[PDB]
Amino acid sequence: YDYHFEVNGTVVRHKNKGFGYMERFFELKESCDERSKLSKKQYERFNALFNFFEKNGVICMAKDAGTLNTSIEINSLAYHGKYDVMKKFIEEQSVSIEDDYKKAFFLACLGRWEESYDLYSNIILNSIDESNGCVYYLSQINRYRIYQSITQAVTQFNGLGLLTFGRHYKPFTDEFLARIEREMTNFNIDDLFNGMPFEFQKKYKILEFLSDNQFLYDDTVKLFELTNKVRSEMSEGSYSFGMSSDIVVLLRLYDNLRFLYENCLWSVSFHEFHQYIRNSMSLLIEKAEYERTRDIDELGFSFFGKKSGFFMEYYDFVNISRHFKIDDIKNLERS
Amino acid sequence: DNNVVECIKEITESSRNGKLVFFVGAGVSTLSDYPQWWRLVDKYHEELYGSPKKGNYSSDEYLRIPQIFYNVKGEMAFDGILKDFFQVDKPTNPIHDKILAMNPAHVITTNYDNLIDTACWKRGKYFSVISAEEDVANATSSRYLLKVAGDFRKGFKGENVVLKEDDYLNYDQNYPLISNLMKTIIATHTIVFIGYGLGDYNINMLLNWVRKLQKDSFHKPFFIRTDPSPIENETLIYYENKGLRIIDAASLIDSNEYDYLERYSAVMDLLIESQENKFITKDDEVIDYIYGKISPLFALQYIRKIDLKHVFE
Amino acid sequence: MKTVIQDTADVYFKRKSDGKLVFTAEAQTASFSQAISEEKLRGGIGNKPLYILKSEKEINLTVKNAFFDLEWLAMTQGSERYEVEYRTIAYNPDTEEVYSDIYIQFPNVSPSGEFEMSLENGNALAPEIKFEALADTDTDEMAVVIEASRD
Amino acid sequence: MKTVIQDTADVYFKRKSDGKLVFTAEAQTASFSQAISEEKLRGGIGNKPLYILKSEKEINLTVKNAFFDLEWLAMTQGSERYEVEYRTIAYNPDTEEVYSDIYIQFPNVSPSGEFEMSLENGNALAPEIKFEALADTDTDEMAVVIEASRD
């Protein structure tokens, strides 16, 4: 909590009573000469540190914040819906442990929920010997969700699915369901961060929220505090300069997708996370309509005398294609 | 039986409080085609004299024979034979998962293998493995897996595993901190004994020692008897006097002599699924339970209706 | 005792060729939605149209339960329509006395469910089932009402 | 570079009867609103008169950066109503070059904030304050705006 990192890539002092170590770095960013007063080791560390942040999108301090045009790039193939090329990828041979993880998620997307779990079991036993901390914790966090998917699936095919389909399809063998019930039977996800070593606990605190359900409840409440405001100004004829409150959501929206895709997590396919995208993109496409229609005296267009017009780009189509049922899309057509 | 009902109640109460610490013997390891100790003694004796001993190995012989082998042949043969006997991987069995299902904060293991370690790392509760006197200081997690007798991670050498008579005689200076931590853990938890015989003189004397210390402050540990022959009331009463509490699998179920796995699974399932409202019994046992949970809440004035889900689990 | 007040409802499902009883004794959400509109059609030629009655028309349904029925659920455990019978009662504001009933008949309802309710935690059941009203080309159907209050 | 684009603003406030400038600079929210309205307050007149063009009118204002001052703050530690100047830059959509800066000043201001945050988890400063522009009997008031772009 020493600093605060705004959504826009800007950073502001929060709890520093000592040297502004963040500030010197950005002072080292622009100073090419000072970048030359380092040893090659130290220079490479800066390069390892510099290459990380630009990929993390951190730009410069708030005091010198200029016109920031943050980029967005989703590269996960599943987000790109290339269901055929992955059907060859899963056929390929494994090279590394990180590659095995990448395949495991790809298996799930194709509906072959059966073999996914076993390789989720196959990766877990071989994981420790390389002493890579992360690759274990997310392998189980992914397991219990695709566990629940099987469990919630098997009842549904029994309860209603017979009416929906007319036959009692059985996608999962009897014996397989037994083992997963046994292995996870008393599994309480809460302690899982409370289990991993102190060595794990000091480096990888930032992965904590994915354990309980506070991660999905944490993000949503802000969208309720962000949405409650914007409708208020919509009924006030107000004008907001600079970054409008709606622009805050979009960065937050795309930030969530990237972290929840490229790490290959499996929470994308659940109903709750779909709830987040529905009420986020609804607010953005809602806000577009009000801008296109309102009055101004003289200075109204003098304030931000242009707009994004919600120029709906390619990813935005990819977003609305998945996450909305037919009924949900109709609700927006009306207003 | 009411005795078994109380046994299950006390075990479940210990489990919910996270005060359950299992104790693992050779019974667990004999369910996963792991070659038994008597086979090891047989190998040593056969090399020593040219043939197996006839008749059951008396308890002293189990410690005396490898002493003879180490005296005569030397350390190298002992190490090589340990490598021949133990350098084999094996797959886990259901009983390991059931043992871990209790979420035991600690697990004592007198065996030599690492199968329990594979089970522990499979479920996902990190256990600070401790097997050498240097391990105690470096233990990370509060959860411990005390392989008291040593292990092979640092090598298949005869110094790392107590297997010769001097070891058990010299246990008091060889692995002392294991002794201290053993005594404290047994002092401050509810210990249960599974797959573990009645012939370990060292541990038997240890439990006797704890009892003579603690007097009436001794939370007696629990023993899960699993031989197909039902325990005898004479033996039951005698050991109850000795200060333990016995749980017999033969009373619960009926099976063949070689159906050890069924018995272990049946007992562990009786622990897992003894859910409890199942044993409410009579009418007037309803109210005292409800009074048991809701009565403390008479200090607060009024309650959110939905929140009652928590207090009723 | 101060303020709130609730009510109840009742659901009945059945398949043609027989009286196979299926039902959900309660329906908390129980959303009934009637809707009719039009966007554009017709070639606008031939001068006299002499008709025009396009009304699309559609009916949705919703119910809640945890009881599918015990016996042939397990029978078929290991497309002749799914008719519905909604029943409830009406009260007189002057007297508030039980005098009137409501009988709702649907001859052609189809199960159009989102078989993707995978939720992030084990919930309190609530297997919501949504339906769409179907009407063949033949005649009548969707809705017919019968009611008590004979007195 | 993909999708966002951002701009900047700037906020100064001042006190009359001296060149004192003890206030914020950078309205993060920078929420601005304007309004006019009418009611039945004049619901009845003697007629044969003319008009008032009342309109009520109101100007709401918001700035959130804080860091007021140390020099003048401390000196004040020992009702002119202050005034506000507003400055922003305007760009050409055709060329996107710097050619004009918006010059805005308001005659009367009167800060009046909800003097209680009490947020359950302490925030990262940024104490948003709302302002209301008073007015007197003399003339003008509201706003006086100047514009660059003499290119």
SS3 readout for chain A: CCEEECCCCCEEECCCCCCCHHHHHHHHHHCHHHHCCCCHHHHHHHHHHHHHHHHHCCCCECCCCCCCCCCCCCCCCHHHCCCCHHHHHCCCCCCCHHHHHHHHHHHHHCCCHHHHHHHHHHHHHHHHHHCCCHHHHHHHHHHHHHHHHHHHHHHHHHHCHHHHHCCCCCCCCHHHHHHHHHHCCCCCHHHHCCCCCHHHHHHCHHHHHHCCCHHHHHHHHHHHHHHHHHHHHHCCCCEECCCCHHHHHHHHHHHHHHHCCCCCCCHHHCHHHHHHHHHHHHHHHHHHHHHHCCCCCCCCCCCCCCCCCCCCCHHHHHHHHHHCCHHHHHHHHHC
Chain centroid to Cα A194, Å, comes to 23
A27 to A44, A76, A172, A291, B163: CA distances (angstroms): 17, 34, 58, 39, 65
Residue C84's closest CA among C8, C10, C12?
C12
Distances (CA, A) of C132 to C31, C34, C35, C64: 12, 10, 12, 16
**Angle, vertex CA A321, rays to CA A315 and CA A324, nearest 5:** 120
What is the DSSP pairing of strand D11-14 with strand D31-35? unpaired
Residue ranges in B139-229 assigned as alpha helix (H): 165-174, 176-187, 201-214
Which has the closest alpha carbon to D110: D132, D90, D142, D78? D132
**SS3 of D93, please?**
coil
> What are C22's two structure tokens?
């299926």
Q: What are phi and psi of B186, to 5 degrees?
A: -60, -30
What are the C-alpha distances in Å from C108 to residues A237, B280, B312, C147? 49, 49, 44, 21
What is the Cα–Cα distance from D117 to A257, expressed in whole angstroms? 33
Count of CA atoms in the C-beta half-sphere (13 A) of A140? 27
Which of A105, A75, A126, A39 is CA-nearest to residue A268?
A: A105
> Dihedrals φ, ψ of B258, to 5°?
-90, 0
The resolution, in angstroms to one decimal, equals 4.3
Report the alpha-carbon distance of residue A196 to residue B125 in Å, rounded: 8
Q: Are B230 and B248 spatial neighbours (Cβ–Cβ below 8 Å)?
A: yes
Distance between CA A109 and CA A78 in Å, rounded?
8
Distance CA B87, CA B157 (A): 12
CA torsion, ordered B299, B302, B308, B311, to nearest 10 deg: -10
Beta-carbon contacts of residue A15 (< 8 Å; ≥ 6 apart): A1, A2, A3
Q: How many CB atoms lie within 10 A of CB A59?
A: 19
Cα three-residue angle A64-A70-A73, rounded to 5 degrees: 155
Backbone dihedral angles phi then psi of residue B261, each to the nearest 5 degrees? -60, -40
Which tokens go with D86?
A: 């507003």
Q: Taking the mean position of all CA atoms in its chain, how far away is CA D125? A: 21
b/e sequence C103-130, b meaning 16+ C-beta within 10 Å: ebbbbbbebebeeeebebeeeeeebbbb
Q: What count of residues does chain C have?
A: 151
Tally of CA atoms within 13 A in the half-sphere of B307 that contains its CB:
5
Determine how many CB atoms are found less than 10 A away from the CB of residue A20.
14
What six digits make up the tokens of B180? 């201290």
* Cα separation, B148 vs B111, whole angstroms: 8
Give the H/E segment covering residue B20. Answer: strand B20-24
| Nearest CA among D125, D118, D117 for reference residue A6 | D125
SS3 of residue D147 by DSSP: strand
Cα separation of the two ends of chain A: 42
- Please answer yes or no on whether B118 and A125 come within 8 Å at the CB atom: yes
- Residues from chain B contacting residue A197 (CB–CB below 8 Å): 126, 140-141
- Rounded CA-CA distance D80/D82 in Å is 6
**Chain A, nearest residue to C75 by Cα:** A168
Cα–Cα distance measured from residue A193 to residue A190, given in angstroms and rounded to the nearest whole number? 7
Query: Nearest-CA neighbor of B183 among B148, B159, B151, B149?
Result: B148
Interface of A with B (CB under 8 A): 124-125, 128, 140, 182-183, 185-186, 191-192, 195-199
Residue B247 β-bridge partners: B224
What 3-state DSSP class applies to D86? strand
**A positions 282-301 inside 8 Å of D (CB):** 297-299
- The answer to whether the CB of D30 falls within 8 A of the CB of D9 is yes
Element (H, E) at D11: strand D11-14
Instruction: Sort out which chain C residues have CB atoms less than 8 A from A270's CB and list them.
Output: 118-120
The residue type of B241 is N
Is there a contact between C118 and A216 if contact means CB atoms under 8 Å apart?
no
Which member of A182, A192, A198 has the closest CB to residue B124? A192
d(CA C90, CA C99): 7
**What is the distance in angstroms between the Cα of A12 and the nearest Cα belonging to chain B?**
36
- For D52, the token pair is 């008032």
A69 → closest Cβ in D6, D31, D88 = D6
Residues of A in contact with D5 (CB under 8 A): 67, 69, 308
CA dihedral sign of residues A4, A137, B147, B220: positive
Interchain proximity D2–A238, CB inside 8 Å:
no
| Concatenated DSSP letters of B127-139 | -EEE-STTHHHH-
Q: How many CA atoms lie within 13 A of B223 on its CB side?
A: 18
CA-nearest of A254, A225, A240 to A307 is A240
> What is the SS3 assignment for D148?
coil
The CA distance from A160 to A169, in Å, is 12
What residues contact residue B153 under an 8 Å CB cut-off, 6+ apart?
B114, B131
Q: Report CA A310 to chain centroid distance, whole Å.
A: 22
Chain B closest CA to A92's CA: distance in Å?
Answer: 27
Chains that touch C (3 or more CB pairs under 8 A): A
Torsion of CA B293, B295, B299, B303, to 10 degrees: 60
| Residue in the block written with tokens 């059609």 | C41
Query: What residues pair up with D33 in beta bridges, in sequence order?
Result: D60
> Among residues C146, C122, C118, C133, which one has the least CA distance to residue C60?
C133
User: Exposed (0-12), middle (13-18) or buried (19+): which is B107, by Cβ within 10 Å?
Assistant: buried
Measure the CA–CA gap between A210 and B232, rounded to whole angstroms.
53
A245 close contact with C: CB closer than 8 A: no
CA distances from B65 to B44, B51, B71, B75 (A): 7, 13, 10, 14
Q: Cα(C34)–Cα(C57) distance, rounded to whole angstroms?
A: 8
Listed in sequence order, the DSSP H helices in chain B are: 2-16, 26-29, 37-49, 59-72, 75-86, 94-101, 115-123, 135-138, 165-174, 176-187, 201-214, 233-242, 249-252, 260-272, 285-294, 308-311
Q: Do C76 and A213 touch (CB under 8 A)?
A: no
